[PDB]
Design a protein around this ligand. Structure first.
Ligand SMILES: [Cl-]
Ligand SMILES: [Mg+2]
Lengths: 241, 243, 244, 111, 231, 250, 235, 195, 240
């Protein structure tokens, strides 16, 4: 059964290598979440540092692709960094060739097309990662676009990724049923981060310290990650309410 | 099955068994460590004296990259040399274009991406080494450890090889007992002790100690080998602690 | 490495056969039958479309019969997509010859080159062969009217009447029975249709499941005309011979 | 425009006896009207009892001698330390020189 | 078993079987011995013949005036590697007017052998080499294995029954290391060392091959009647 | 390193089957139902927008794609394979035609170029076939309106009307009853919506249905005025609101 | 399947070892080196009586001072001979001299291992390269597809090799004349050959310093065959 | 090289080509045949740059002979001339173009008609009743305009050709050492030995 | 490029791909070559399961490589065209550089070398073809007949056959062909060639092709009636 080793069709029209790449996604056992505000897009991810000898500042699955675009990865770090470096190069080249900053959705498509090539061409394996791209696009506004090893991609009102993704997904679905809108109706990004953390706490059922989380925030003309103290300040605000 | 016969093939778990098999070659190799300190890093390695016929001090395993980065590894020694040769090419092209010497995090990703590239195709074999490396740059001291998968992180202390668990346990005690920091000269002495303690897991053949270090104050930010009086002082410190 | 997954398309069996060529021929044996009949004053090409659907657009469709130049046409049996690759190559080859020598390409030369391409895919490159058999119908001033066939092996032969695709065994027996050398085009038209009508796997032979073409000297004085039959023209010729 | 050649002057002289041979050359190296060196040798022992000089443009002369010395070395490796005969050396040098027929070594060579 | 089809495949215990099989070709090869003092370095090689009508396979190759090796295993692979060493030694001379350090010679061989163990299609070198040389830091002896591993030693031996000579040198270490300014005595110690690997056969005139390099001695090989002194 | 897969991954089996093409067709069978109907004065192509999640914005994912101003495409099977085919199809329309002749290719020839690309994935080294079937609707001056189906093999067939994917067998039978040669475009849109309701299970509205037409020229969608010969694209994607209007009088 | 350049567990290249089996199936070729010259002789082995035996070219000139006899898949030898001839002539062009027999053999043996995944497989032919040069005199070399070559005083290759080699072991001494060596090749060929030895199914050749490499006529070999039979009957 | 002429009459094509090969101030040869038989009924004469002429002629000859063997069929003079023109048309935009002018005289066996083609080094082809390359044309064209008739015999064509050679021998600056004359007709190619 | 080593050695020292190519030759229609005192004759079988053929345009079994050399074959027909084309190109190239047509030996040696190259080149399979190459060297009246095979070996033959049932016709030729006295005339040589094919063929109608080659580029193919006369004459003498 060599049709399960390379990316060719099985008798039932399936690509097993692609399906097994999807299972590599959860190998880190980390859950991510992304939501949109009025002016911003917030992404949050669990941060697990098991080894005491690790330098916790270097342990990260969130990446600054360009000034405007941020990317969080669900999957092993080597493939995550492979994807990040390529996305950075693609975003830079786009700006040089076409004279404007690469949009979040266009980068997502480009990376998705690359992923598609690995599902069709035999010598290249799929990357075992799910890439969630976030920005505040100058045309489309707050944006979340997500790519997988199949080469599939789509925009999102909000999204979640990881082992307990379904619990987070339904938690967010129920909120948007209630609020009757496509986003978090909130002025400051600080409170959108608070929303994101609060709803992750409810869905996963765990409490978070400052070092258990990792936060990325996209605003107009910049994407940035929060420090431990920025998150701690944010956790204190949730607790006092 | 047959998922483990070819590199870059995902198993039904989502694993690349060929990379995990390369890790076994690393686990088989001699012990090597890295200790981050106040203003730099210290590297040390176990050299098994196979025979009396081995010339002492003349089978050097620790390698320098550029002038400010030290690299040490455990597993297939030739694979480690190939990786350093690439590292030197990467560091040379960085300095050529950007003038400044390559930063350690920048350098770490250059090796990471190259090792990760050897998990993408069935026409190449994964690297049979875990590489501990680091140095001093504009932002201070950095220690890294890189694995056959291309996975790397920053470390306070790092260890790999046959005596990795013994060394890790000893490293964890140093991190706990010295929260404010460990000095460069202390780290050299501790490195010696930890190699001697980690030698208990490889005690058939007796061994030769080799240490190197980068420190902003002690070596002026450059990579140097610990030799002569400072080496013997570290050996004596290690000898006193085992007894 | 990649050796593991190589089918080895260009090798011999222990018996001295080319596996892939033999299996490509097996593929072609399920394709709709195509018949060529060469008369003294023209050539007929007849072909059966593969199980037609009632909602298929019949008039603006081309599956079996293709034009290579003004003097040469081909009937296809096998994978259409593969045939189109080869047809465009053959079309280009004909124009290269015309550009070079200022003369229309002799039929055999075009056939040989197309057959040499197929041969290449069986001897080198490690690729699968083209799953296609052609019937070439054409005219030149050296040999006059000519019928050829080529198959995935790259071997070609000349014929007075020939069939490719499905039920060739039965079709060839029927052609061998009723064919004679002093035959006219209009008689060959009738023979072609009668043969398909008996060898068809369908219940009854109808206009919508046929492609038809003639190459006559029926133009005005010493010149050749290609006629790719329209749906209504096939309907009329089918009534005229008394099949429907 | 860049001129890749120059004239370093000097002169050389070879004479052959019955059981010996001499190859002489002055030690002066010049450019235009200046003296570069009063002692810059240009007659070299190349091994196998072969002496050589390539006078004219010194850079091309040094390059040629360097290549022939290296040619002698590889002749030993490839042919079981066989002594390179003077006639065989000569023919080898022809191929070195002619190899640059369309960008010549500006030298008069004597062995 | 299932992991020895090519060099690109690791076994479940982390072994490279094609490299190990290449290592096996060395064990089948005829014995050769290396040893050095502070002033000189010596290679001693037992040559092998096909039969009495054949010549004895030449084991020792010269790389430069100051460096050379002895081989054990596939002789054509030794020819490729020795040729590479000749070029590297020669590059160092032409470009830098510098004799190639014996340590760098080893590093270059290691890296060349390694590339063949990590790529599909190729194969490991099927030969082991003992490189001797005299450079700016005195006399040297190296042991090359086609895994890539190169090792600097006082003395060693490779080939069939090389453990006999290797044990002898391990005992004699303190004696032969101090044979300074005496070529013939250092060779004698090497000839006595290789004699510990002999079974049924003894050292004859067209069987023994000796090479030496040192302080005021270019790399020179002795065969035939020139080695009759040491029998 | 390097692509060592220089050999065919699709080969003939002893029975004469091309396994990978058959298996690609099986992947198309699993795919969501899409259809196309040709009218006298237009063509309609339609499909269901299968949403992966309710949090996902299905507007951002376009199953019906403009290839040229007068040609549109829809698919059934693997979405990523379709997306790259659309990219290549758009580009080939320029490189192999518009940059030569100064005008857009006719439907049949663009279809032929797409078919060629899909055939090469069936024979070239180190690749699998595309896991999609396309329905390409288009108009050109000399051929008028046309509708084509393109399969993983690279074979293409012109259709009066057809369906592909999940419930294609039932959908084709439905279309055979309703189709005639005198259908106006609005009648074809009506039948398309009826046919598609059979295969769709969940919600059936303008937000879950994607539908486009090849009809009259749209000067309002051109973007400029002044050139009389340039009259605008015949391809138009129906809006969510425009679909719901026709679902009331269903 | 498996790689072309793969090692066996015993430390040998599979393909090289399999090519050696092909060489054992080949027709017998014998070479004997003396101080008066080197003799080369081969079994022609015509597959049918209708085949014109004089067209069987298994002994071949490389240069005036170097000859060559082959055994195994003889079609594979053509490109080896072509390379040898070019190497010999090219060296004469570059150095105005004859090329050493050993250096020629080494150049041929460099082709041997240039196979893998360069050509697709090793050569299926062994060569006996006989010649003369001023330095090492009369020489005989056995060049294998392993890339290895041994110098020999005498050597047999092909199907009757192990039986002929044992015979050459006893018969060869350092004072053999050329005439003695010619008869010895004919004697040993007649022993190991299936069909009865004559001038048509066996061929002799030699290389001497004075006359260079010469293939013998069927008339000349026939007289040596007749001389051989008389000498064996004489005791 | 220098003088090549061609005359197409009723039933044949006649090619006259100068015998002199000059380099510098020396006539090296006075019996040179500046022509190659491309096929049994097709002859090509040539003139131009030294070396290029023969190299080109023989290259064309080899290609036509290869075609003949492959198809067991003689290419028509028109077909050969078109092939030759295309080769020159490629050549002119090459790194180093063939500087060769040719006349192609052939008898088409299918049409039963003689044909004369004039092709210059640029790839400029024309079918003509009479043709010339180089300075020859400046005398012969006007002479043939006057004396040529389309229905002439081969013998009349040879007298007409004698008239051209006489004029060239009178008014040309260089000594071209007479001409080799060859006739191409239904029976193939033959050389006139006494001219 | 496709690199795979398809022709490789097996444990017993055989190259199976080359040997399987010989099986393709054994499947092919029979071809025979007989050389007389002043001529060579090439006889060829044509299988009679193919009726409704057009013999005018169907590729002939004997091919001219030059005006003085011919090539017949047994095995894969498509493969033979590639060898014939290369041989024809080399024939013209030889005339161009040497100013002399090829010898029959040289042309054979070239074709055989091409066949050999395809037995140790990566990505290719051997030619499933054996050839009989016959003719007369330039300015020479001695007949030449050579054989080649997929492995690349070649040799000269007084008479030889290849293809299916070739072992039967080789048996016939081995007793009927006298080396001391070959067929003195054209008629004798053609008759012996036709006789040898009649051991295998079936009927002597449109199943036998005969091509006679004589010195100085004198090659002619016999027609049906001309061959049928030999068939009629042989059968009447047989009934005895
Ligand atoms: Cl893209
Ligand atoms: Mg002109």
């Amino acid at each position: 059964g060599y049709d399960r080793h390379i990316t060719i069709f099985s008798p039932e029209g399936r690509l097993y290598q692609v399906e097994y790449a999807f299972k590599a996604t959860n190998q880190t056992n980390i859950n991510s979440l992304a939501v949109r505000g009025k002016d911003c897009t917030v992404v949050i991810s669990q941060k697990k540092v098991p080894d005491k000898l690790l330098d916790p500042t270097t342990v990260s699955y969130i990446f600054c692709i360009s000034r405007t675009i941020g990317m969080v990865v669900n999957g092993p770090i080597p493939d995550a960094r492979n994807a990040a470096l390529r996305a950075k190069a693609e975003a830079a080249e786009f700006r040089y060739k076409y004279g404007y900053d690469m949009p979040c959705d266009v980068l997502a498509k480009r990376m998705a097309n690359l992923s598609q090539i690995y599902t069709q061409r035999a010598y290249m394996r799929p990357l075992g990662v799910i890439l969630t791209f976030v920005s505040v696009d100058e045309e489309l506004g707050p944006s979340i676009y997500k790519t997988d090893p199949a080469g599939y991609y789509v925009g999102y009102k909000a999204t979640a990724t990881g082992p307990k993704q379904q619990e987070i997904t339904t938690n967010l679905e129920n909120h948007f049923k209630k609020s009757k809108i496509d986003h978090i109706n909130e002025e400051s990004w600080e409170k959108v981060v608070e929303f994101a953390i609060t709803h992750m706490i409810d869905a996963l059922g765990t409490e978070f310290s400052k070092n258990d989380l990792e936060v990325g925030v996209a605003t107009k003309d910049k994407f940035f990650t929060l420090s431990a103290e920025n998150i701690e300040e944010r956790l204190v605000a949730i607790a006092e309410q | 099955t047959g998922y483990d016969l070819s590199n870059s093939v995902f198993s039904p778990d989502g694993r690349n068994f060929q990379v995990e098999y390369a890790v076994k070659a690393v686990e088989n190799g001699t012990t090597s460590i890295g200790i981050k300190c106040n203003d730099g890093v210290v590297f040390a390695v176990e050299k098994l004296i196979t025979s009396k016929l081995l010339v002492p001090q003349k089978n050097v395993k620790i390698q320098v990259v550029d002038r400010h980065i030290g690299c040490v590894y455990s597993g297939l020694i030739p694979d480690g040399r190939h990786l350093v040769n690439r590292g030197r090419e990467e560091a040379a092209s960085f300095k050529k274009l950007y003038k400044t010497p390559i930063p350690i995090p920048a350098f770490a990703d250059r090796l990471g991406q190259y090792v990760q590239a050897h998990t993408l195709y069935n026409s190449v074999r994964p690297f049979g080494v875990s590489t501990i490396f680091g140095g001093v740059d504009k932002n201070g001291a950095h220690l890294y450890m890189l694995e056959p998968s291309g996975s790397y992180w920053g470390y306070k202390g790092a260890a790999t090889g046959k005596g990795r668990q013994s060394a890790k346990a000893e490293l964890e005690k140093l991190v706990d007992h010295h929260p404010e920091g460990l000095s460069a000269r202390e780290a050299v002495k501790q490195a010696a002790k930890i190699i001697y303690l980690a030698h208990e897991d490889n005690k058939e053949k007796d061994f030769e100690l080799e240490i190197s270090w980068c420190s902003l104050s002690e070596t002026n930010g450059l990579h140097k080998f610990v030799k002569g009086d400072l080496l013997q002082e570290a050996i004596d410190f290690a000898q006193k602690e085992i007894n | 490495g990649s050796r593991r997954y190589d089918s080895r398309t260009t090798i011999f069996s222990p018996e001295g056969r080319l596996y892939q060529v033999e299996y490509a021929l097996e593929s072609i044996s399920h394709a709709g039958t195509a018949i060529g009949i060469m008369a003294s004053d023209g050539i007929v090409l007849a072909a059966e479309r593969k199980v037609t659907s009632t909602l298929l657009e019949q008039d603006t469709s081309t599956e079996k019969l293709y034009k290579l130049n003004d003097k040469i046409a081909v009937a296809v049996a096998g994978l259409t997509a593969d045939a189109e690759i080869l047809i465009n190559t053959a079309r280009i080859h004909a124009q290269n010859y015309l550009k070079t020598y200022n003369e229309d390409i002799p039929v055999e030369i075009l056939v040989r080159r197309l057959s040499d391409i197929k041969q290449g895919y069986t001897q080198h490159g490690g690729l699968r062969p083209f799953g296609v058999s052609f019937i070439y119908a054409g005219y030149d001033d050296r040999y006059g009217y000519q019928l050829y066939t080529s198959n995935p092996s790259g071997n070609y032969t000349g014929w007075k009447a020939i069939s490719v695709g499905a039920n060739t065994s039965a079709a060839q027996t029927l052609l061998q029975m009723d064919y004679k050398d002093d035959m006219k085009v209009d008689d060959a038209i009738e023979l072609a249709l009668k043969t398909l009508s008996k060898t068809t796997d369908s219940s009854a032979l109808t206009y919508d499941r046929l492609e038809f073409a003639t190459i006559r000297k029926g133009a005005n004085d010493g010149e050749v005309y290609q006629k790719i039959f329209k749906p209504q023209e096939i309907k009329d010729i089918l009534v005229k011979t008394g099949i429907t | 425009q860049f001129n890749p050649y120059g004239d370093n002057g000097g002169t050389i002289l070879g004479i052959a006896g019955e059981d010996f041979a001499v190859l002489a050359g002055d030690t002066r190296n010049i450019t235009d009207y200046s003296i570069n060196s009063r002692y810059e040798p240009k007659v070299f022992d190349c091994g196998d009892n072969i002496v050589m000089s390539a006078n004219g443009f010194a850079a091309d002369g040094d390059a040629l001698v360097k290549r022939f010395k290296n040619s002698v070395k590889w002749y030993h490796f490839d042919h079981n330390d066989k002594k390179l005969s003077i006639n065989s050396a000569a023919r080898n040098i022809q191929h070195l020189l002619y190899g640059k027929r369309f960008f010549p070594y500006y030298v008069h060579t004597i062995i | 078993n299932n992991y020895d089809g090519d060099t690109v495949t690791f076994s479940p215990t982390g072994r490279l079987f094609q490299v190990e099989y290449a290592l096996e070709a060395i064990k089948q090869g005829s014995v050769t011995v290396g040893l050095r003092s502070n002033t000189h370095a010596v290679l001693v090689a037992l040559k092998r013949n096909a039969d009495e009508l054949s010549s004895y396979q030449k084991k020792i190759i010269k790389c430069d005036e100051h460096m050379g090796l002895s081989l054990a295993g596939l002789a054509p692979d030794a020819r490729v590697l020795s040729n590479y060493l000749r070029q590297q030694c020669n590059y160092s001379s032409l470009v830098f007017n510098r004799k190639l350090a014996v340590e760098r010679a080893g590093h270059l061989l290691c890296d060349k052998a390694q590339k063949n163990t990590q790529s599909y299609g190729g194969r490991p070198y099927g030969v082991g080499l003992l490189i001797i040389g005299y450079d700016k830091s005195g006399a040297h002896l190296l042991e090359f294995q086609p895994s890539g591993n190169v090792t600097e030693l006082y003395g060693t031996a490779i080939g069939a029954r090389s453990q006999g000579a290797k044990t002898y040198l391990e005992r004699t270490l303190d004696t032969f290391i101090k044979i300074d300014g005496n070529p013939d005595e250092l060779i004698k110690a090497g000839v006595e060392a290789i004699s510990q690997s002999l079974r049924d056969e003894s050292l004859t005139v067209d069987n023994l091959s000796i090479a030496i390099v040192g302080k005021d001695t270019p790399f020179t090989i002795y065969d035939g009647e020139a080695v009759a002194k040491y029998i | 390193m390097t692509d060592r897969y220089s050999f065919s991954l699709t080969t003939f089996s002893p029975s004469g089957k091309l396994g990978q093409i058959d298996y690609a067709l099986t992947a198309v069978k699993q795919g969501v139902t899409s259809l196309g109907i040709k009218a006298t004065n237009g063509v309609v192509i339609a499909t269901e927008k299968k949403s992966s999640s309710p949090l996902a914005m299905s507007e951002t994912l376009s199953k019906v794609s403009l290839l040229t101003p007068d040609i549109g495409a829809v698919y059934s099977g693997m979405g990523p394979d379709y997306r790259v085919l659309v990219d290549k199809s758009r580009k080939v329309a320029h490189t192999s035609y518009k940059r030569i002749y100064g005008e857009y290719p006719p439907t049949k020839l663009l279809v032929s170029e797409v078919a060629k690309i899909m055939q090469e994935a069936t024979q070239s080294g180190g690749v699998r076939p595309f896991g999609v079937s396309l329905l390409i609707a288009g108009h050109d001056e000399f051929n008028g309106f046309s509708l084509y189906q393109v399969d993983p093999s690279g074979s293409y067939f012109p259709w009066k009307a057809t369906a592909i994917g999940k419930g294609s067998v039932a959908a084709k039978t439905f279309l055979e009853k309703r189709w005639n040669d005198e259908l106006e475009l609005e009648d074809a849109i009506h039948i398309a919506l009826l046919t598609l309701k059979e295969s769709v299970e969940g919600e059936f509205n303008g937000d879950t249905i994607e539908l486009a037409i090849i009809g009259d020229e749209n000067p309002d969608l051109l973007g400029y005025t002044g050139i009389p010969t340039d009259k605008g694209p015949r391809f138009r994607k129906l809006t969510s609101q425009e679909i719901n209007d026709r679902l009331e009088a269903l | 399947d498996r790689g072309v350049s793969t090692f066996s567990p015993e430390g040998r290249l599979f393909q090289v070892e399999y090519s050696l089996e092909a060489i054992k199936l080949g027709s017998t070729a014998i070479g004997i080196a003396t101080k008066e010259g080197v003799v080369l002789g081969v079994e022609k082995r015509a597959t049918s009586p209708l085949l014109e035996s004089d067209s069987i070219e298994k002994i071949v000139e490389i240069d005036r001072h170097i000859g060559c006899a082959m055994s195994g898949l003889t079609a594979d030898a053509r490109s080896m001979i072509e390379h040898a001839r070019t190497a010999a002539v090219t060296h004469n062009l570059y150095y105005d001299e004859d090329i050493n027999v050993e250096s020629l053999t080494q150049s041929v043996c460099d082709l041997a291992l240039r196979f893998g995944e360069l050509m697709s497989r090793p050569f299926g032919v062994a060569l006996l390269i006989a010649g003369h040069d001023a330095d090492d005199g009369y020489q005989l070399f056995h060049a294998e597809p392993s890339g290895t070559f041994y110098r020999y005083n005498a050597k047999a290759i092909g199907s009757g090799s192990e039986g002929a080699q044992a015979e050459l072991l006893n018969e060869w001494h350092s004072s053999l004349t050329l005439k003695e060596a010619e008869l010895l090749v004919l004697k040993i060929l007649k022993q190991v050959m299936e069909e009865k030895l004559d001038e048509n199914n066996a061929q002799l050749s030699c290389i001497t310093k004075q006359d260079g490499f010469k293939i013998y006529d069927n008339e000349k070999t026939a007289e040596l065959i007749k001389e051989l039979k008389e000498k064996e009957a004489a005791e | 090289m220098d003088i090549i002429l061609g005359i197409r009459v009723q039933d044949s094509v006649i090619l006259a080509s100068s015998k002199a090969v000059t380099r510098g101030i020396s006539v090296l040869k006075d019996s040179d045949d500046k022509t190659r038989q491309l096929s049994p009924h097709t002859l090509m004469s040539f003139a131009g740059e030294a070396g290029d002429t023969v190299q080109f002629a023989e290259y064309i000859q080899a290609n036509i002979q290869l075609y003949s063997i492959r198809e067991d069929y003689e290419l028509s003079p028109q077909a050969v001339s078109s092939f030759v023109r295309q080769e020159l048309a490629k050549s002119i935009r090459s790194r180093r173009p063939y500087q060769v002018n040719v006349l192609i005289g052939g008898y088409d066996k299918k049409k039963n008609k003689p044909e004369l083609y004039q092709i210059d080094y640029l790839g400029t082809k024309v079918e003509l009743p009479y043709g010339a390359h180089g300075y020859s044309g400046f005398y012969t064209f006007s002479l043939l305009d006057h004396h040529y008739r389309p229905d002439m015999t081969t013998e009349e064509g040879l007298d007409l050709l004698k008239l051209c050679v006489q004029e060239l021998e009178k008014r040309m600056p260089m000594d071209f050492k007479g001409v080799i004359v060859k006739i191409v007709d239904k029976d193939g190619i033959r050389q006139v030995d006494d001219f | 490029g496709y690199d795979r080593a398809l022709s490789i050695f097996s444990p017993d020292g055989h190259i199976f791909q080359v040997e399987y190519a010989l099986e393709a030759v054994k499947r092919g229609t029979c071809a025979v070559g007989v050389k007389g005192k002043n001529c060579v004759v090439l006889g060829c079988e044509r299988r009679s399961t193919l009726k409704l053929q057009d013999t005018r345009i169907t590729p002939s079994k004997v091919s001219k490589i030059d005006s003085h050399v011919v090539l017949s074959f047994s095995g894969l027909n498509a493969d033979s065209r590639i060898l014939i084309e290369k041989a024809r190109v080399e024939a013209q190239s030889h005339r161009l550089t040497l100013e002399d047509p090829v010898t029959v030996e040289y042309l054979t040696r070239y074709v055989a070398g091409v066949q050999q190259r395809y037995t140790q080149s990566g990505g290719v399979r051997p030619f499933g073809v054996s050839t009989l190459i016959a003719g007369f060297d330039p300015r020479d009246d001695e007949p030449k007949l050579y054989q080649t095979e997929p492995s690349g070996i070649y040799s000269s033959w007084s008479a030889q056959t290849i293809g299916r049932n070739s072992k039967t016709v080789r048996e016939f030729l081995e007793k009927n062909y006298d080396r001391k006295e070959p067929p003195a005339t054209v008629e004798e040589c053609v008759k012996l060639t036709v006789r040898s094919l009649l051991e295998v063929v079936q009927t002597g109608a449109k199943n036998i092709e005969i091509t006679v080659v004589k010195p100085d580029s004198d090659i002619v193919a016999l027609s049906s009636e001309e061959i049928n006369q030999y068939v009629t004459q042989i059968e009447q003498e047989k009934q005895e």
